[PDB]
Amino acid sequence: MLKAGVHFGHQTRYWNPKMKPFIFGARNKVHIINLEKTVPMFNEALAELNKIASRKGKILFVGTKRAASEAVKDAALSCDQFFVNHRWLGGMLTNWKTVRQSIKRLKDLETQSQDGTFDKLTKKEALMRTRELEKLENSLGGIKDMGGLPDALFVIDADHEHIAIKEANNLGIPVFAIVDTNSDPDGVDFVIPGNDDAIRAVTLYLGAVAATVREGRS
């Protein structure tokens, strides 16, 4: 489960004192996460996360910053699971009700789009409707086939995606976050002290998570 890796921590600026148990913290004004603390934390997250993944649950990867996209689309979509990669709408969990009818409009407009009446009656309004499918497709992308509110939540940055953590704490959903030294372990049930903005680190990181999700009872 342990591989020598490349991130070793980051974020000189705006570091958070609640990350003080997780910091080794030496070099050149920047903070180094104690990865000897990360490895048991991340193995625990794989443990409980595989435990809910084997109970046939829905996981909802969250990847708004770049380049977490399309790495969260690649990792969630490598499993049979769900994702948010563009702007996470304020309240797609806590009013999922209204977001249910927006997802319903995305389904009705893609069914109307590639099969039904798309060339019908107008060119301009048809262009309008297609770019409504671009907007509703990139905002409600992964979540469009969920049909429930999910059994866990896996966010890739705790301070950048504080809204989703705040809602999953509001609803009693287990939050699995890779925090950095600027972030805050709010209500993150399974904190992982890592590096949020390195693409090597998040592809290794989501590689491991997507690896352990796609083992159910099989």
Q: Which is nearer to RNA, 26 or 127 (CB)?
A: 127
Q: Which is nearer to RNA, 29 or 124 (CB)?
A: 124
Q: Which is nearer to RNA, 47 or 128 (CB)?
A: 128
Supply angle C-alpha 197, 16, 206, rounded to 5.
Answer: 30
The span of 46-54, 83-91, 113-121, 197-205 binding RNA (CB under 7 A) equals 83-91
Amino acid identity, position 100: R
Cβ proximity of 218 and 205 under 8 Å:
no
Q: Which is nearer to RNA, 12 or 170 (CB)?
A: 170
In the complex, least distance from residue 37 CB atom to RNA, rounded to whole angstroms: 30
Give the whole-angstrom CA distance, residue 131 versus residue 173.
33
Residue from 5, 24, 74, 91 that binds RNA (CB under 7 A)? 91
**Please, what is the angle between helix 199-213 and helix 35-53, to 10°?**
40
**Closest among 78, 80, 98 to 89, alpha carbons compared:** 98
Q: Which positions from 164 through 193 interact with RNA, judged by CB under 7 A?
A: 166-167, 170
In the complex, least distance from residue 91 CB atom to RNA, rounded to whole angstroms: 3
Q: Write out the two tokens for 202.
A: 């998040």
Cβ proximity of 174 and 189 under 8 Å:
yes
90 binds RNA (CB under 7 A): yes
Give the whole-angstrom CA distance, residue 42 versus residue 49.
10
The contact mask relative to RNA for 111-150 (x = CB under 7 A, - = no) is --------------------x---xx--x-----------
CA distances from 168 to 11, 153, 175 (A): 26, 7, 7
In the complex, least distance from residue 23 CB atom to RNA, rounded to whole angstroms: 27
The span of 17-25, 55-63, 95-103, 184-192 binding RNA (CB under 7 A) equals 95-103
Count of residues near RNA by CB under 7 A: 19
Give the whole-angstrom CA distance, residue 53 versus residue 113.
34
Site residues, RNA (CB under 7 A): 87, 89-91, 94-95, 97-99, 101-102, 131, 135-136, 139, 163, 166-167, 170
